[PDB]
Structures are given as structure tokens and as C-alpha cells.
Amino acid sequence: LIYQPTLTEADLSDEQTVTRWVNALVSELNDKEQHGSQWKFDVHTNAEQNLFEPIVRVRTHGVDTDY
Amino acid sequence: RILGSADRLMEVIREELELVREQFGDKRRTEITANSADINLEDLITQED
């Protein structure tokens, strides 16, 4: 997250900047992997403020987890 | 092939565990019972005249 572009609160409702941001982050993570992990992404839509919270999924040692 | 799937990993782990069990198994020494009762000291003395 240090080298990726900063994501601001005002960008949490576009639903398009978030998708590209998370896709770039996941691609960068998958590019440099050296321990056998796999990375995927998902976008969550909230019905309260029409926000779009990013979701990151990873499979390590055969175990799936969502962050 | 091993790195591609998790079922293969679980099979390897299971085989290792089974080999360990078959190589270092033994028996049980301690016995387990169920709450042995007490003695009132009167049932140990025969009742007579």
C-alpha cells in the first residue's frame, strides 16, 4: 500500500476508481509472489451511503480468507 | 501436482500421520473408573446378637 496511489474518502462512491485501484493492487501482488499464494478481489456495495468497500481474498496453504 | 491441489496435501499429511502411528504406538497403563462410593463403617460389621 505504500507504493500504490492514495485512495481518498471522496473516491469511495465512484465504483469505478475503486475497481481499477483494487485490480491494480491485486495484479501487483500476484506479480511478485514467491510463496505459492493466490490473490483475488471483490467489491462490496453498501445500501446505506451507496459506498463501495474493497475486499481482498487470498489462498495460503490451502486456506481461504477475506480481508 | 502436489502444489496444485489441497486434497493431495491432506493425503500426504494423513499418510505421514498413519506411518507415525504404526511406528510408535503402544498400550494404555492407567485405568479410568466412575466415582467409587464411600463406606459408612456399619456395613462392614455383621449384624447379630
Question: What's the 3-state SS for A20-62?
Answer: HHHHHHHHHHHHCCCCCCEEEEEEEECCCCCCEEEEEEEEECC
Taking the alpha carbons at both ends of chain A, their separation in whole angstroms is 14
Residues of chain B contacting residue A36, judged by C-beta atoms under 8 Å apart: 3
Strand order in the sheet with A38-45: A38-45, A52-60, A63-66
B7-13: long-range contacts (C-beta < 8 A, 24 or more apart)?
B9/A62, B10/A62
The alpha carbon of residue A52 and the mean position of all alpha carbons in its chain are separated, in whole angstroms, by 11
CA A30 to chain centre: 12
Kindly identify which residue of chain A lies nearest to residue B8, measuring between CA atoms.
Answer: A62
A18 burial (CB, 10 Å; 0-12 / 13-18 / 19+) is buried
Say yes or no for a CB contact (<8 Å) between A62 and B3: no
CA atoms within 13 A on the CB side of B12: 8
Is A35 touching B (CB cutoff 8 A)?
A: no
**Which residues from chain A sit within 8 angstroms of residue B6, using beta carbons?**
62
Resolution (A): 2.3
